[PDB]
Amino acid sequence: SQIVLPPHLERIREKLAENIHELWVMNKIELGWQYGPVRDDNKRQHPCLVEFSKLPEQERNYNLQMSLETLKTLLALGCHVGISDEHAEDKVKKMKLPKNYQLTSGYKPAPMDLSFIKLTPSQEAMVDKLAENAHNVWARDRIRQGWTYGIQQDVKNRRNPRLVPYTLLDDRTKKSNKDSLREAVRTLLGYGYNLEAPDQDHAARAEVCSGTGERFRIFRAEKTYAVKAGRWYFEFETVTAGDMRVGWSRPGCQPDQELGSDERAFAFDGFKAQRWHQGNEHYGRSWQAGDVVGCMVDMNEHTMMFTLNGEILLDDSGSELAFKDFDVGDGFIPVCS
């Protein structure tokens, strides 16, 4: 609402609204509709088949403010629009239509053909977002009206399964809205108002919005199973690929502290190909879903090794040792984060 509307859109919005409404009245007459004073559906009767001045002007103003909000959301979403040239709006070629596809009156509704206009992929994403906004507005209207979501459509209880996010909406209706809005956008583009979408900016959630402030959970064996001598082996299978650390930890490891950030833990972060002990150093490669990590510790000569599906991981140097020398201390236990 706070957006201010440029004068050229201001004196072109009426013609845009009438032309797009005429596109829908051409769509319904192609789908097989017939004009009727009463707003029937089974008998194919509705006043919204005739041109913009011959149907109820209250519906005309409804669709006019619909066009206004469409273009005004186009501006609100940062899609600045200019004109290619004023003569491209002065002269518009008209398609040829059969009479049955034509309306009742002689005001030829159909604009220059859809084939002439090309839609940039950025513009396609722009129409995708604009239809998202339109569906959100429509749903919010019925939310104020009292409608709520239901698994099955109900009229007396005011329950509609369509009151769902657009990403979960039904494909047929969402694509119908998509194509209608795409026809409208193609019309504005053909009018010489070549709209360029704002530069596509990438946003990363980075696993920040985890449920509850807990960012990780550490799983370890019991302290009594700590090994102080000998060489041992255990496996870690990664169902998913992401922020995972596996290795060996001392019985003093703190659950709230990340593995390898301090001395108690020796871990291998394969998300970043990153080894962790009192800091992070580059070691090995990254895994994928289903990869199995084999962890080796030899408490006699104080070395640790890792494998990824069998092949031994190597650091920046050709050394096979993830960690070269560490005190035995109180022992080590298997651990994962």
Give residues in contact with ligand ATP (CB under 6 A): 48, 59, 62-63, 142, 153, 160, 162
C-beta closer to ligand ATP: residue 130 or 296: 130
Q: Which of 139-178 are b and which e, b meaning 16 or more Cβ less than 10 Å from the residue's Cβ?
A: beeeeeeebeeeeeeeeeeeebebbeebeebeeeebeebb
Question: From the CB of 161, what's the least distance to ligand ATP, in Å?
Answer: 8
Shortest distance in whole angstroms from residue 111 CB to ligand ATP = 19
**CA dist., res. 302 & res. 314, Å (int):** 17
* CB nearer to ligand ATP: pick between 158 and 228: 158
- As measured in angstroms, the least distance from the Cβ of 79 to ligand ATP is 24
Which lies closer to ligand ATP via its Cβ, residue 153 or residue 286? 153
Based on CB atoms, which residue is closest to ligand ATP, 59 or 243?
59
**In this structure, are strands 245-249 and 265-269 parallel, antiparallel, or unpaired?**
antiparallel
Of all residues in this chain, which one has the CB nearest to ligand ATP in the complex? 162
Query: If you count them, how many residues does the chain have?
Result: 337
CA-based nearest residue to 188, from 65, 108, 89, 94: 89
Alpha helices in 50-191 (DSSP H): 57-76, 86-90, 121-145, 171-190
The nearest distance, CB 26 to ligand ATP, in angstroms, is: 13
Nearer to ligand ATP, 131 or 335 (CB): 131
Q: How far is the CB of 43 from ligand ATP (least distance, A)?
A: 16
